């Protein structure tokens, strides 16, 4: 426990918080919230504020709508951009049913359950360092998004060429004021693409932070006349946005992945973990890459994974192990995209890597190659498996896997699959302008 | 035995033909032609006219490009709209290699070969009655088609609501004069959609007609400032276009499909044949629906097939048996669309049919309802299989069927998969406007 | 030389530098950089800040793309146009492989090698006086360049005729605050053409100045 009720009651006074936001995440990963006058703090810290659960994607149904919000005192944060008109402190909340029991369809609560399985394997921390890339597009005169990138710069470009420098600098100011620990910021490879990085934290706090980050990026971008989007591949022909997940296990306050005296200085535990990620890779892609668009990023040549294999310092596989060692030894899973529900992506990646460990699975030979250029025949000779090629293809692999299905739980899994089936179906029945360009004059 | 070289030399002189068109069809079904003045008739009738087979989709390669054209005398036809400035007669041709052997990749030639397997089983002829629907779009001032449908009429609608009577009327005039037996003409169910029906003929003549038909429709439509298209599904939410294939087998010059003393007055051959179609249905669909857009028509609710079954006088299954009997007893295969290559679609439908008869397979119980309004449960319990849902699924199915693969021949099979694999890959990596409307703001 | 690690640590405080830019040059000569908060200063000074070497023209391949940055302490400079919202200091860096050995395709490092061949022949300095001239074009309402020159002046022309006087005046002021010794400033022969001149220096420092000048020119013209 970071904060206690008394701390929060005193913080609110000595900081002049005028409004409280209670936030939570839906099944698709969208931030949701209600705001209450700070005079309703007691009501909320008593877990008494309610909302209509049948209006949040993948929650309850209309006949049994009432649902409750239980604020987590340790997520208390103030939003700087609200202080001049009416200062706002947020709480992230867990969803409870009317009868006192947790909602089993809350993505955040599910992640906590998978983290308890980790505690029983003897580990005491699951660190996640997320790196969610985004694009910036220009607003029109009506404040609506256009298709014009904010610039035509590239990787590590400097201003004139990079025009996101000021917006990024203003995003970093708000995050730093909010307690984020910023590590780096830069223009990314495609035009109008950007990244800001920040220190890894425990699984739950890191997803909370992915949520707060997407929020602060979209808000500040809008003040500079821009529209930020974490959509995976907004444009054909250039890089998509990734949300790489750097994963590590701690045991006794020490990176259990580092072994001073061992091959590549990776301990056996790290090797079993990688063995887990690898085994369930094709199976958890539906969760880590939940939109139709996601599969347009998973194509070779754009520094995105499209083949299951791991390697050191290699930006073409599904798992790179960066050259860092010691406390920074980590398994980077490069398939996750920023459309993923962070709570559910970690649930499924934790379960995969805990499977490999608890059953001491053997890691495969690393592929130290540019997998993108190695031929069909050659990668099947190495047992290199392709990731699912569409969201429908990914959903089918996901259904087939018991340990991943258990990783979500009945409610999450039933709702997640239904929502994705609807989406895929809409997409598949649409007639796209492409089809008209290709066939309307040819046939 | 319709025309001999002497007939042709005589007609050409009496009709005052001034140019000759030598036409053939490529692997996609696209009509191709070269024109030659009538002084070169002898060169053409000696099979000496050559072309770059390396520049026709699906034929030969650049280092072996020289190919020859052999006019089929019985396809002589004068194009009336060309008589005012310089009268043009056409010939459909067979592709030959420069050594003198037929080309193995020539779609029309391939239909001939499957027809020889029909003769080996003892049938005089295979009759096809095509009805390939089309849409009319308005051209703009640059002569380019727009998305404005020519009218907002519906099925069997009368003029002012039907503004297509003009154009069809002229299409029918050209066709009647080029020797077609026209049977009916009308507005069809969707806005701007039209049908012009014509008498069946023997498979090879029927596929030549379909090619000549699409040619004449597009031409006369352009004279009314309209763009005619046989694209399967030009617009989401309204009917697509089909090219329903009315099939029948004759023997001793009699319809082998009729048996007045049988149940439904459908003979054994019919029943076996229908069993052949149902068996290979999910497998030949890649051929009979060869475009990405084809699969957007193959959705429930539009009088297009969705599910492999058959029924009498029912417009919801894959195979409908129309009410008429006697010389008109026929099996109507409604999955084919007017983007299919007519020769290869006949070749795979005949092959499937003939497998049914050869092994005397047993037809399934006819499903006598609206398959669209059946639940997932009902359909499974009845053994009702789904058609492939994308071009990629259809390709995989097609590959694993030796009898369909062999219906295509080696060259065609190999070149078909290559062209459609490429086509599919372009489509899948494309980022569509839909994806942006859905995700660009949501994420 | 110029600065030690401890000098830098102290400078950073007195100036209230808030962000550090680690910059380097790719094979085409185009400056590249990443920005980190001042709290990461110790990480950068430890040669611990990494980057994707495959995403930079002329560097490493994607199979072995991790690459390290080794800031040259002597190249510490504050960017005046950033103080107002988050004061930035840059470091120019050498490129190192993840094994501790210098990267053989680093253009700045290669220049140091030819300089060692100079030393063993008896010389102690190779000085360069670069005179990189530039044109100025008018941007449009969408901040995109047009082909309209800023003016139609010629060599040594005075204002009304020369309309780049203020631009080059602001440039010269940024450079002077960044420690440049500016020597001359004028309009050059062609329409819309300008020259700013600065004192020569050691070959490496002077190439560092060319990359710095191009940056400050493009920034203030905008
Ligand atoms: N032990 C660890 N466990 C999880 N994540 C870590 C660990 N050490 C570092 N990280 C995180 O990994 C992420 C790497 O981001 P970045 O430095 O952008 O990586 P890259 O080298 O992939 O470009 C950072 O968020 C960093 O804090
Ligand atoms: N024995 C037969 N074999 C094949 N096709 C036939 C036979 N008898 C009639 N047809 C054809 O089937 C097609 C039926 O077209 P249409 O009358 O539009 O049918 P529908 O009842 O589907 O609207 C026509 O081309 C017609 O010439
Ligand atoms: N000994 C030297 N070595 C190298 N460069 C020098 C030396 N002395 C002066 N320079 C430089 O040469 C450049 C001459 O520039 P400028 O005055 O523009 O010459 P020009 O006469 O060609 O116009 C200046 O940058 C100046 O500092
Ligand atoms: C330039 S990259 O290797 C580009 C990655 C890409 N955007 C993707 O994952 O789709 N990212 P990083 O070096 O931060 O790991
Ligand atoms: C009106 S219908 O069932 C409409 C058919 C639809 N165009 C389709 O096959 O996709 N055709 P028809 O009655 O000629 O057989
Ligand atoms: Mg990164
Ligand atoms: Mg990145
Ligand atoms: Mg990364
Ligand atoms: Mg009809
Ligand atoms: Mg019809
Ligand atoms: Mg019909
Ligand atoms: Mg000079
Ligand atoms: Mg000069």
CATH number at residue A243: 3.30.590.10
Q: What is the largest CA-CA distance in chain B?
A: 73
- The span from the CA of C20 to the CA of A159, in Å, is 15
How far C122 CA lies from chain A's nearest CA (Å)?
39
Minimal-distance CA residue to ligand 2 atom 27: B199
Q: Token match 């009218």: residue? A: B151
Domain boundary among A106, A124, A144: A106
Rounded CA separation B84/B78 (Å): 12
Q: Does C177 show up as a binding residue in the annotation?
A: no
3-state SS assignment for residue A265: helix
Q: CA-to-CA distance for B34 and B48, rounded, in angstroms?
A: 13
Ligand nearest to the CA of residue B183, numbered in listed order:
2
Alpha-carbon gap: B379 to the closest alpha carbon of chain A (Å): 19
Long-range (24+ apart) CB contacts under 8 A made by B370-374 are B370/B314, B370/B316, B371/B300, B371/B306, B371/B307, B371/B309, B371/B316, B371/B317, B372/B300, B372/B301, B372/B306, B372/B316
DSSP code of residue A53? G
d(CA B77, CA B45): 15
State how far the Cα of B194 lies from the Cα of B157, in Å rounded to an integer.
10
Q: Quick one: A93 and A150 in the same domain?
A: no
Report yes or no: A151 and A164 within 8 Å, Cβ to Cβ. Answer: yes
C168 CB-near residues (< 8 Å, 6+ apart): C185, C194, C196
B270 vs B277: CA distance, rounded Å: 10
Last residue of some domain: B44, B73, B106?
B106
Q: Is C133 one of the annotated binding-site residues?
A: yes
Contact of C215 with C31, CB cutoff 8 Å? yes
Q: Are residue A185 and residue A292 in the same domain, yes or no?
A: yes
Kindly report each contact of residues A382-386 with a partner whose C-beta sits within 8 Å and lies 24 or more positions away, as own/partner.
A382/A309, A384/A307, A384/A308, A384/A309, A385/A281, A385/A282, A385/A307, A385/A308, A386/A282, A386/A306, A386/A307, A386/A308
CA B131 to chain centre: 9
H runs (alpha helix) in A49-164: 83-86, 107-120
Rounded CA separation C88/C194 (Å):
28
d(CA B258, CA B324): 10
Whether residue B265 sits in one domain with residue B175: yes
Last residue of some domain: B106, B137, B153? B106
CB B291 within 8 Å of CB B303: no
Residue A97 in tokens: 């049913």
Residue nearest to atom 25 of ligand 1 (CA): A129
Q: Which two tokens stand for residue A239?
A: 């890089």
Catalytic residue among B151, B162, B259, B332: B332
Tokens describing residue B360: 């005397």
3-state secondary structure of A227: strand
Cα–Cα distance between C93 and C31 in angstroms, integer? 11
B240 lines ligand 5 (CB under 6 A): yes
Q: Report the C-alpha gap between A91 and A196 in whole angstroms.
A: 24
A123 and A91 part of one domain: no
CA distance A149 to A135: 8
Rounded CA-CA distance B358/B194 in Å is 38
- d(Cα A293, Cα A237) in Å, to the nearest integer? 14
Are A366 and A257 within one domain?
A: yes
Identify the DSSP state of A125. Answer: E
What is the number of the ligand 2 atom nearest to the C-alpha of B198?
Answer: 25
Backbone angles phi, psi at B66, to 5 degrees: -60, 125
Using a 6 Å cutoff on CB, does residue A35 contact ligand 4? no
- Cβ distance C104 to C177 under 8 Å? no
Q: At what angle do helices B268-288 and B410-429 cross, to 10 degrees?
A: 50
Domain carrying residue A232? 107-443
Reduce the secondary structure of chain B to three states and give it as a string: CCCCHHHHHHHHHHCCCCEEEEEEECCCCCEEEEEEEHHHHHHHHCCCEEEECCCCCCCCCHHHCEEEEEECHHHCEEEHHHHHHHCEEEEEEEEECCCCCECCCCHHHHHHHHHHHHHHCCCCEEEEEEEECEEEEEECCCCCEEEEECCCCCCCCCCCCCCCHHHHHHHHHHHHHCCCCEEEEEECCCCCEEEEEECCEEHHHHHHHHHHHHHHHHHHHHHCCEEEECCCCCCCCCCCCCEEEEEEEEECCEECCECCCCHHHECHHHHHHHHHHHHHHHHHHHHHCCCCCHHHHCCCCCCCCCEECEEECCCCCCEEECCCCHHHCCEEECCCCCCCCHHHHHHHHHHHHHHHHHCCCCCCCCCCCCHHHCCHHHHHHHCCEECCCCHHHHHHHHHCCHHHHHHHCHHHHHHHHHHHHHHHHHHHHCCCHHHHHHHCCCC
Residues A203, A85 within the same domain: no
Q: Under 8 Å CB-to-CB from B15, ≥6 apart: which residues?
A: B78, B87, B89
Question: Residue holding tokens 């069927």?
Answer: B401
Residues B213 and B234 placed together within one structural domain of the fold: yes
Q: Exposed, middle or buried: residue C16 (CB in 10 Å: 0-12, 13-18, 19+)? A: exposed
**Residue C38 and residue C19 in contact, taking contact as beta carbons nearer than 8 Å:** yes
> A97 and A229 in one domain?
no
Answer whether A97's CB lies under 8 Å from A104's CB: no
Residues after which chain B has a gap (C–N > 2.5 Å): none
Contact A52, A65 (CB under 8 A): yes
Q: What angle do CA A207, A209, A212 make, to 5 degrees?
A: 120
Phi, psi of A70 (to 5 degrees): -120, 100
For residues C57 and C27, is the Cβ–Cβ distance under 8 A?
yes
Q: Residue C71 burial (CB < 10 Å; 0-12/13-18/19+)?
A: buried
Q: Cβ(B108) to ligand 2 under 6 A? A: no
Greatest distance between any 2 Cα atoms in chain A: 73
**In this complex, does chain C touch chain B, defined as having at least 3 beta-carbon pairs under 8 Å apart?**
no
B341, two tokens:
């290559």
Is beta strand C31-37 parallel, antiparallel or unpaired with respect to C19-25?
antiparallel
Give me the DSSP letters along chain C.
Answer: ----HHHHHHHHHHHT--EEEEEEE-TTS-EEEEEEEGGGHHHHHTT-EEEEGGGSTTS--GGG-EEEEEEEEEEEEE-GGGHHHH-EEEEEEEEE-TTSSBPTT-HHHHHHHHHHHHHHTT----EE-----EE-EEE-TTS-EEEEES----TTPPTTT---HHHHHHHHHHHHHTT--EEEEEE-SSTTEEEEEE--EEHHHHHHHHHHHHHHHHHHH-
CA–centroid distance, residue B330 to ligand 9 (Å): 13
The CA distance from B88 to B74, in Å, is 16
Counting ligands in written order, the one closest to the CA of B313 is 2
Q: List residues in chain A that are followed by a break over 2.5 Å (C to N).
A: none
CA distance B338 to A411: 45
Distance CA A443, CA B4 (A): 34
Q: Give dist(CA A412, CA C14) in Å, integer.
A: 54
- CA B359 from chain centre, in angstroms, equals 27
- Say whether both B329 and B402 belong to one domain: yes
> Which 3 state secondary structure label does DSSP give A443?
coil
What's the residue count for chain C?
222
Instruction: Looking at the structure, tell me whether residues B30 and B129 fall in a common domain.
Output: no
Residues B67/B75, Cβ–Cβ less than 8 Å:
no
Q: Which two tokens stand for residue B25?
A: 């069809």
Same structural domain, B284 and B244: yes
Q: Is A189 on the interface with C (CB under 8 A)?
A: yes
A242: left (phi over 0), alpha (psi -120 to 50) or beta: beta
Residue ranges lining ligand 3, Cβ < 6 Å: C 127-129, 131, 183-184, 197, 199-200
Catalytic residues of A: 52, 131, 133, 188, 195, 244, 315, 332, 334
Quick check: A237 and A221 in contact, CB under 8 A? no
**Which among B234, B338, B431 is the nearest to A233, CB-wise?**
B431
Closest Cα of chain A to C110: distance in Å? 22
User: Distance between CA B57 and CA A303 in Å, rounded?
Assistant: 34
Q: Which residues are found with C-beta within 5 Å of the ion, ligand 10?
A: B 195
**Residue B14 labelled as part of a binding site:** no
The answer to whether the beta carbons of residues A295 and A394 sit under 8 Å apart is yes
C-alpha span between C6 and B407 (Å, rounded): 81
Is the separation of the CB atoms in C79 and C88 below 8 Å? yes
Structure tokens at C126: 């190779």
Q: How many domains is chain A partitioned into structurally?
A: 2
Helix axes A391-399, A268-288, angle to 10 degrees: 120
> Are residues B191 and B78 located together in one domain of the fold?
no
Answer whether B160 touches A (CB < 8 Å): no
- What are the C-alpha distances in Å from B222 to residues A117, B218, B275? 70, 6, 43
Residue numbers in C near A183 (CB within 8 A): 36-37, 40
C-alpha B301, offset from chain centre: 22
E strands, A180-330, in order? 182-187, 193-198, 201-202, 226-229, 243-250, 307-308, 310-312, 319-321
Token couple for A94: 């867990």
Sign of CA pseudo-dihedral A153, A159, A163, A165: positive
With CB atoms and an 8 Å threshold, state whether B431 touches A229: no
Q: Report long-range pairs for A398-402 (Cβ below 8 Å, ≥24 apart).
A: A398/A283, A398/A284, A398/A285, A398/A286, A398/A287, A400/A283, A401/A280, A401/A283, A401/A284
| Cα(A360)–Cα(A121) distance, integer angstroms | 12
Considering only the C-alpha atoms of chain C, give the largest distance between any 2 of them, rounded to a whole number of Å: 59
Nearest ligand, CA of residue A273?
Answer: 1
A-chain CB neighbours of B235 within 8 Å are 431
Phi-psi sector, B326: left (phi>0), alpha (psi -120 to 50), beta: left
DSSP-derived 3-state class of residue A78:
strand
Here the tokens at position B424 are 């599919």
- Is B315 among the catalytic positions? yes
CB B66 within 8 A of CB B39: no
d(CA A289, CA B83): 62
Residue A64 tokens read as 């049994």
Q: Are A304 and A359 in contact (CB under 8 A)?
A: no
Assess contact for B406 and B398: CB atoms under 8 A: no
- Cα(B319) to ligand 5 centroid in Å equals 12
């Amino acid at each position: 426990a970071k904060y206690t009720r008394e701390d929060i009651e005193k913080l609110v006074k000595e900081e002049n918080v005028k409004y409280i936001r209670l936030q939570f995440t839906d099944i698709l990963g969208t931030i949701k919230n209600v705001e209450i006058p700070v005079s309703q703090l007691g009501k909320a810290l008593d877990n008494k504020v309610m909302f209509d659960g049948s209006s949040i994607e993948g929650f309850v149904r209309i006949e049994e709508s009432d649902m409750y919000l239980y604020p987590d005192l340790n997520t208390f944060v103030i939003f700087p951009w609200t202080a001049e008109k009416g200062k706002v402190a947020r709480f992230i909340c867990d969803i409870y049913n009317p009868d006192g029991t947790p909602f089993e369809g809350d993505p955040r609560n599910n992640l906590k359950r998978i983290l308890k399985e980790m505690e029983d394997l003897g580990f005491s921390d699951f660190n996640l360092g997320p790196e969610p890339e985004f694009f910036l597009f220009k607003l029109d005169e009506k404040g609506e998004p256009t298709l014009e990138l904010n610039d035509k710069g590239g990787y590590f470009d400097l201003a004139p060429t990079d025009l996101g420098e000021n917006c990024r600098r203003d995003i970093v100011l708000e995050l730093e004021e909010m307690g984020f620990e910023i590590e780096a910021s830069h223009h990314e490879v495609a035009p109008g693409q950007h990244e800001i990085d920040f220190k890894y934290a425990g699984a739950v706090r890191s997803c909370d932070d992915i949520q707060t980050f997407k929020l602060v990026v979209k808000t500040i971008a809008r003040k500079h006349g821009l529209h930020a989007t974490f959509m995976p591949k907004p444009l054909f022909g250039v890089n998509g946005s990734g949300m790489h997940c750097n994963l590590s296990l701690f045991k006794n306050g020490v990176n259990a992945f580092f072994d001073e005296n061992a091959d590549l200085q990776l301990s056996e535990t790290a090797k079993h973990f990688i063995a887990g990620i690898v085994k369930h890779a094709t199976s958890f892609t539906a969760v880590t890459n939940p939109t139709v668009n996601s599969y347009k990023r998973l194509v070779p040549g754009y520094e995105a994974p499209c083949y299951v294999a791991w390697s050191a310092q290699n930006r073409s596989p599904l798992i790179r192990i960066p050259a860092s060692r010691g406390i920074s030894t980590r398994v980077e899973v490069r398939s996750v995209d920023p459309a993923a529900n962070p709570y559910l992506a970690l649930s499924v990646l934790l379960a995969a890597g805990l499977d490999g460990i608890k059953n001491k699975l053997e890691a495969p030979a690393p592929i130290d190659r540019n997998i993108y250029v190695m031929s069909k025949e050659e990668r099947m000779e190495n047992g290199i498996v392709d990731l699912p090629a569409t969201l429908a293809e990914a959903l089918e692999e996901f259904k087939s896997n018991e340990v991943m299905v258990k990783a979500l739980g009945e409610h999450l899994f039933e709702h997640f699959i239904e929502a994705k089936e609807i989406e895929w179906d809409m997409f598949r029945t649409q007639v796209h302008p492409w089809e008209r360009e290709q066939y309307m004059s040819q046939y």
